[PDB]
Amino acid sequence: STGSATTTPIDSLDDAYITPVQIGTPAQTLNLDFDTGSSDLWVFSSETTASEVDGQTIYTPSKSTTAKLLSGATWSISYGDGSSSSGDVYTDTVSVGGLTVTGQAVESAKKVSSSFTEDSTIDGLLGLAFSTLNTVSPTQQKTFFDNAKASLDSPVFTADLGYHAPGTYNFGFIDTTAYTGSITYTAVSTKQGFWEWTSTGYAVGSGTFKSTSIDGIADTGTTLLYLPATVVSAYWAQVSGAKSSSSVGGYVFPCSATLPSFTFGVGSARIVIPGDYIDFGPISTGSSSCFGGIQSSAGIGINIFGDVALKAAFVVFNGATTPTLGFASK
Ligand SMILES: CC[C@](C)(CN)N1CCOCC1
Ligand SMILES: CC[C@](C)(CN)N1CCOCC1
Known part of the structure; x- marks a missing residue:
């Protein structure tokens, strides 16, 4: 298998890039920040404190027929800029640019810091560092790439970020x-x-x-x-x-x-x-x-x-x- 998705700068300075991601059944499309420096796939959700959501698209697990609560699992991340978020965990079907992973850990935010709330264009993060950094406790979870890897034509993904323009994330091929x-x-x-x-x-x-x-x-x-x-x-x-x-x-x-x-x-x-x-x-x-x-x-x-x-x-x-x-x- 392979996947290919367009990634788009969130603003005129290329402060970050968002990539559409399909979560659940029927698909809920969220625009995620693909992050090769972290290893959690976490999203704004129906469980996020209402005052901490400001324009983001949310994941609603209760509307997904393939979502399952990962019992007892929690997550909590504090990035290197003071920002943070935490919550619970579901497994669900996640697709990126035609590439589908079943049973992907989707980390639902119950709390997010103001720095995430203010980024109205970023609905969550999709981590692409190594799964050893994943914060889910007590059972660490795999990244989307890690889960997809065996099925890919080639165990690779590529980042082709644009300057003031759209670019591409490809999975499974060069x-x-x-x-x-x-x-x-x-x-x-x-x-x-x-x-x-x-x-x-x-x-x-x-x-x-x-x-x-x-x-x-x-x-x-x-x-x-x-x-x-x-x-x-x-x-x-x-x-x-x-x-x-x-x-x-x-x-x-x-x-x-x-x-x-x-x-x-x-x-x-x-x-x-x-x-x-x-x-x-x-x-x-x-x-x-x-x-x-x-x-x-x-x-x-x-x-x-x-x-x-x-x-x-x-x-x-x-x-x-x-x-x-x-x-x-x-
Ligand atoms: C990444 C640079 C950043 C944070 C973009 N909003 N600012 C820092 C302050 O001076 C203007 C540029
Ligand atoms: C993590 C929050 C932070 C640093 C600041 N609201 N954003 C800025 C926009 O680009 C993505 C990162």
Whole structure:
């Protein structure tokens, strides 16, 4: 089997991407944030505290003839931005772009933090990291990918995120028309439950490539690119007027600037992030100070190749017995 679904930026800054997902019988279609940095499939639901729902589409298990309460199972997640959610668990039929999994754990939110409530466009998350990070207790549950894997033509999914445009998540096959050149594969460590890999270095604009190992995770659920302070300083040093602002919480730059590209290494290959991808617009409405798309990971404990980086590439998440990551230009 295979599946193919279009993923769409939620706003004009590509803050996140939503992908339609069919849950239950008859289908209830929710727009989920596919997140390769977490491993829970959780949704706004009929059980969510009413005051904590603000425009989201909800999953109503009682209207699904295939939904079954997973007795005694609860979940609770606290992401790395203070946001959180928790609730109970059903198993139900879940389909993505024509690919169907029966008995998928669907985590129904009883509570969500304000940061999720405010995102009216995101009806939940579909985690695509390793199932070892799944928060369901007392019996940990598998991701959609993990459940689908054996049935797939090939045990892979790919992320093809667009810049200010729709893109594609494919399951079970590589679309060889969706990228240029070849795919460079690189080793993955699953020890932290992430798609964790090591970049071979970077360049700023037309500058010389610096060979240096940078460990990090491929995370479709993070907006920006978080890298070591040395790397980030080197980048923003090339932008007149750029500075790290403690009050804003990162590097800012004059909105009138044209940004340099940023290149990262994948083995001997190179992925170029165009400068425009690194512009996340005014810090507040009407401001001429703009927020940078490359930020320091110093306060995080891990480097994160989020959407800023990933949308510059065609990315293969290879779930073979020994997982690997593939990157191609596009
Ligand atoms: C998780 C909440 C958060 C960070 C903030 N409301 N969203 C912002 C929009 O893009 C998805 C993530
Ligand atoms: C991801 C960047 C983010 C959170 C997008 N809403 N902002 C931060 C503040 O300056 C403008 C950009």
